[PDB]
């Protein structure tokens with residue numbers, strides 16, 4: 001019997017960034 | 026909302042959405058689900074190009090016209106765009122802000138219905154990566170309570186792998202089976218679409234042409250499904266009528282115009298699909314005799330099987346032809362196959378059965394199963410026939426093949442289809458199957474041992490019965506027994522090779538005049554009974570191509586030609602002549 | 606009937622959802638399928654049809670027009686396939702018992718190993734049995750499963766190996782078409 | 796002539812980009828080569844020097860003198876390396892037959908099986924031949940490609956599903972370099 005082959009699974013990375021505000025006056 | 030959701034009833038009033046034809050059975054199931062108190066979210070599951078979105082979009086058309094039941098009247102279908110909605114968020118809460126606003130609008134209108142094309146996208150990654158706040162989870166409680174109605178569309182491949190992983194979402198969405206329509210249904214569908222396509226291209230499609238498009242496309246285009254396939258060929262024909270005509274040409278689209286566009290889609294030379302290639306088939310036997318002379322009984326047999334296959338008398342599911350070229354070497358058993366492909370203008374496939382001798386070699390032809398090396402590879406045999414549906418298949422030295430390989434061919438002859446590792450059905454009923462073996466030649470030439478010689482006429486056939494199993498021989502259409510080359514036939518072979526060398530050098534400007542004595546000498550040395558005429562190309566290369574090639578670059582032979590070959594009787598060697 | 610029928614036929618869903626799906630869908634059918642002469646009540650016959658659509662096989666319509674099909678099934682097969690009447694009797698009688706409600710309830714409709722010479726009708730009666738019954742034909746050529754490792758193709762590869770997402774051909778095919786004829790040609794070669 | 800030598804010697808870009816680049820490059824060089832003098836006309840020998848810079852090959856080899864180098868191929872190898880004179884001379888006559896244009900063009904130009912004791916310069920003639928003709932040198936040791944699984948690497952990597960750019964080891968080298976010698980060592984043990 002031929003040897004088995006394993007397949008890896010790569011997870012993508014994406015994140016959300018907050019936003020600070022600066023009033024003019 | 027403002028741009029993420031596009032209403033289909035308002036669009037239907039203007040146009041755009043094509044009308045539905047022959048889908049009352051499928052529509053009735055959807056309406057029954059939409060009218061349910063809970064889980065009224067039908068899911069259209071069907072293969073690619075089977076009208077997956079023609080039923081959702083057409084539901085709006087029916088609602089505007091009024092064909093739908095009274096309960097479904099006053100309902101609005103919304104086509105959600107996940108890409109547009111998800112695009113431009115650039116924040117954690119922008120998606121939920123717009124998404125919830127969409128649900129708020131639908132929740133307010135109890136009769137509103139949502140259409141989510143390609144619903145499998147949200148389950149994978151709707152609006153979150155490296156987290157768990159997905160778009161599906163937001164609508165899970167709403168669907169369970171029947172607050173909003175959602176119509177989904179996803180393919181079977183994207184339904185078993187992506188969908189059904191989150192049983193919660195699958196529970197809410199009912200499944201409506203969609204099947205590819207028949208040929209009679211599609212021709213009726215194209216008739217309804219003719220005014221839209223005709224006005225767009227300002228042409229007319231004959232009734233005969235429409236029936237030929239679906240029929241020819243199915244035979245020559247197997248990758249795509251029939252509904253979208255027929256639309257592509259029909260629409261493509263109108264485009265040609267816009268650019269090819271110079272001015273005031275015929276607007277009607279005849280059958281001949283469809284055969285050209287469909288040929289390009291299949292990468293064929295237009296000879297097979299065209300109905301004007303009968304001249305080639307009528308003289309195919311005579312043409313092959315000039316290319317490969319000898320054994321006329323073997324050449325005429327192929328033409329008879331090919332003629333019936335293209336005359337409407339071919340087998341319903343078996344290949345065009347299965348043959349076992351049982352004969353000696355050097356009788357052009359493989360040459361007849363390569364030349365046949367050129368005549369029919371189809372790809373040539375050659376497989377060496379000597380490599381497939383071990384029990385584990387059969388896997389390479391059909392691919393390795395899941396979980397083992399080679400699974401990514403579809404398979405040499407399966408990928409070749411799938412890539413080239415119209416091609417010639419050659420299997421040389423089949424007798425040496427392992428029995429596991431013979432078993433694969435059993436289904437090929439009877440059913441015309443072979444499954445691969447990935448499950449793709451190799452529909453190649455158009456390819457002609459040819460096999461070459463030298464099993465019985467040994468008994469024919471070799472006499473029976475003993476003082477008295479027995480009748481060996483039937484001994485050759487008996488060997489094929491023991492080597493090949495009865496089921497394999499029964500599936501074969503015919504066995505072509507080749508005959509040994511005669512003294513006159515071999516002399517013509519020498520002229521054939523010299524013609525290729527003569528014409529190859531004639532264009533260069535070097536004339537070749539081979540003497541008759543040299544031709545006779547090359548025949549004996551070049552043609553061995555055990556090995557056939559295979560050494561002819563080798564001796565011709567060493568005897569003629571080697572000396573002439575050297576002087577071609579430098580010397581008088583570069584120009585002027587005037588080459589005259591001769592043979593001396595004192596030493597029997599071949600003399601060479603060169604002049605300016 | 607909805608609770609009992611759902612457990613016996615509907616699969617991949619739990620009993621509260623399964624029973625409530627048949628009851629809800631049955632209300633829309635009786636309320637919307639007949640344009641006129643509607644049925645105010647919902648009898649057992651209606652619930653059986655709804656379960657049959659969800660599971661693709663009926664349980665009480667056997668004495669309907671389909672009844673006449675089972676009678677001519679044996680005779681029609683004899684016309685298409687001559688001789689070997691004993692084999693047609695086995696298939697037609699097995700279907701009749703299953704449809705009539707005398708099935709095993711834990712085994713298939715029938716499992717018959719047709720063995721004989723080449724070209725005598727082994728792969729014809731089966732092909733002509735699906736066409737007469739109007740059901741999909743799950744044709745599986747066992748000549749491909751020559752080695753033990755080929756079993757993965759039938760039930761898919763296990764987790765953590767290539768081809769895991771592909772799944773099983775036999776399992777997925779049967780799930781798509783539960784009512785069908787499963788043909789394993791040349792089983793000995795496997 | 797520019798198009799013939801551009802595609803062969805550069806071996807970096809495709810045919811259409813090379814011609815437009817060399818033509819523009821040639822005009823600029825001749826336009827500013829002398830401080831005061833100038834040559835409105837162009838010649839083959841002039842543009843040949845330009846290709847040498849982008850190709851990083853001497854102008855002599857870049858010159859369209861393949862016949863000259865082929866004629867003195869034996870004299871060049873015998874002068875650059877010593878020994879195996881009989882073996883080197885036989886190789887030159889055979890290569891001339893292929894470059895003459897006779898025979899089937901689809902077939903490969905190189906059909907040579909070296910066979911002798913190592914350490915006598917067998918490897919050196921393969922690199923010297925490529926250096927003289929200008930073609931690249933691609934060395935593929937068969938000993939590494941001994942395992943049955945290793946054979947598959949030549950056509951494609953086993954786990955390279957995302958990485959389809961690399962492709963097979965043998966195929967990528969030939970694809971990138973269409974004019975290069977392939978040196979296979981220890982082919983008997985395969």
Ligand SMILES: Nc1ncnc2c1ncn2[C@@H]1O[C@H](COP(=O)(O)OP(=O)(O)OP(O)(O)=S)[C@@H](O)[C@H]1O
Pocket residue numbers: 495496499685686687688721722723724725726727728729730
């Ligand atoms: N009893 C039969 N009645 C009518 N046609 C038959 C009959 N037996 C064989 N045929 C014809 O021969 C074809 C092949 O018969 P099958 O029964 O399918 O062969 P098979 O038993 O699968 O053969 P193997 O693979 O060699 S064991 C059928 O498709 C019919 O065309």
Ligand SMILES: Nc1ncnc2c1ncn2[C@@H]1O[C@H](COP(=O)(O)OP(=O)(O)O)[C@@H](O)[C@H]1O
Pocket residue numbers: 043044045046047048072073074075076077078079214218252253256
């Ligand atoms: N019943 C039908 N009536 C009219 N046109 C149809 C019908 N079914 C399919 N079509 C046409 O065939 C195509 C169907 O594409 P569709 O199945 O929605 O694509 P996809 O599978 O990629 O989502 C469209 O061009 C559509 O107009």
Ligand SMILES: Nc1ncnc2c1ncn2[C@@H]1O[C@H](COP(=O)(O)OP(=O)(O)O)[C@@H](O)[C@H]1O
Pocket residue numbers: 316317318319353354355356357358359360361461518557558559562
């Ligand atoms: N009868 C023939 N007519 C023309 N060429 C022939 C004939 N017999 C052999 N040849 C030549 O022999 C060579 C090999 O032909 P091929 O068909 O591969 O042989 P085989 O059937 O013995 O395997 C080719 O050069 C082919 O043209």
Ligand SMILES: Nc1ncnc2c1ncn2[C@@H]1O[C@H](COP(=O)(O)OP(=O)(O)O)[C@@H](O)[C@H]1O
Pocket residue numbers: 876877878913914915916917918919
């Ligand atoms: N004919 C020769 N002339 C000069 N040096 C030689 C000769 N034959 C062998 N050698 C020496 O032996 C080496 C053998 O080749 P090398 O590339 O080092 O290893 P390999 O033979 O394993 O490829 C040469 O590089 C050189 O050092």
Ligand SMILES: [Mg+2]
Pocket residue numbers: 077078142
């Ligand atoms: Mg679509």
Ligand SMILES: [Mg+2]
Pocket residue numbers: 727728790791
């Ligand atoms: Mg059979």
Ligand SMILES: [Mg+2]
Pocket residue numbers: 913914915916917918919
């Ligand atoms: Mg060395």
